[PDB]
Amino acid sequence: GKDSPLVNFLGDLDELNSFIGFAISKIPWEDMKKDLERVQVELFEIGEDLSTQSSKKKIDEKYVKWLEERTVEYRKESGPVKLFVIPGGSEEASVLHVTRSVARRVERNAVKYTKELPEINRMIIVYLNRLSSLLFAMALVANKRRNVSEKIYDIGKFW
Amino acid sequence: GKDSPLVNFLGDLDELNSFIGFAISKIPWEDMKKDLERVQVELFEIGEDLSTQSSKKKIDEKYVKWLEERTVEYRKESGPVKLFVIPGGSEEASVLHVTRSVARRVERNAVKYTKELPEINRMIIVYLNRLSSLLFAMALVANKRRNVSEKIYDIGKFW
Amino acid sequence: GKDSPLVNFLGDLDELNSFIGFAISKIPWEDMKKDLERVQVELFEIGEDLSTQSSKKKIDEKYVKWLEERTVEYRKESGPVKLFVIPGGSEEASVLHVTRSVARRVERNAVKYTKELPEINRMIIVYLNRLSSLLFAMALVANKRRNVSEKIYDIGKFW
């Protein structure tokens, strides 16, 4: 039976994974390609965690850790940015922002699916949350590397 | 708490805003880039309207007006087109059509969110409706500027 | 009245149709462009089937047949591939995978819409299911034609 919470969650993961594959094909920098390729493998691990109630794979803090550390490294390169950043700029940053918004849609759906499947590993939602911040940091670096300035809808805070 | 109607509406606005950022990065014409960049700022204003029950920003008829006037200008350039237009053609028109279909998805979701949040400013749904027609008109002009003919699934009407 | 199951189904078909239009604009091979252009026309026929309770157009086995036969031809060219394929590679295969994941989202939604509209022609869901496999086969051929190797998250089976 389809349309189930599990099938839909796996479907959302695949959609996100496919946009990531598209971002990788449009980004020329090896550091970002390497990081994103690791995320794709881990999205498959997340799917196996979900599909086997954490029996075959179990997402834990180390997965989340790596996302946070890479996020810190990209931000070190881009430097501080005013919030909010209007998504866009270089085609590389633009595709990363699209991918980021899809990751956020999967994150919201995951919270909803957890209501129907309380057994879902909570670390999965944390991973998804950290992933969107990593994608955001990568988009900032993409524009910097492309000599493109960030467009801001200024709310008075910076990151 | 996430998964709420407000958080989901804001998430949909961000996804649309990100596709618009992607369309801008793929379009070489300054008139379209200028118009789309204004829409991105206004999507942030729409988000603030929603988030503050129209206290900090309030979408009104003038926002919608500008969308309609620009729509008329693009259509003046493309001339009449038979309906239905099969989405595609130049990469520029194709990305505009994708963006248009996402705007329509946000518009439908907005109608659904209004059921859970009757306080939402109705002008927001009107803005979203006009935006998809503007994106459609821009896609027609994009193909014309690219010497690409529109593909038609003819229903006997023209616009 | 919007937000209805019919309006949402038609909206999902349009979103899928628009991504297909985008994939066509990014693919240089005439065989794939021809096949995808036929799918776009048929998505409009599916919309008319839905909108007229199969009165004006009626999706039947021959539609599905053509999808399966073309799928077999692309697979003959790509040869066998290990599963699971991590979506991505060439920009052509990447956009095809994104389109494939959207087709799968429309397929899942269709199952849900059928619950609210039991009159929907069941062959429509079958068509959507076959379409995602065709898109998958095309993505394999796209990478082969681009000298790009498939990335695999190996589950021990091949197709």
From TrEMBL, chains A, B, C:
Keywords on record: ATP-binding, Nucleotide-binding, Transferase
Pfam families on file: Cob_adeno_trans
Cobalamin adenosyltransferase-like domain: residues covered: 1-141
Enzyme category, top tier: transferase
EC number(s) per entry: 2.5.1.17
SUPFAM superfamilies per UniProt: Cobalamin adenosyltransferase-like
GO terms assigned for molecular function: ATP binding; corrinoid adenosyltransferase activity
Name listed for the protein in its UniProt record: PduO-type ATP--cob(I)alamin adenosyltransferase
Gene: ST1454
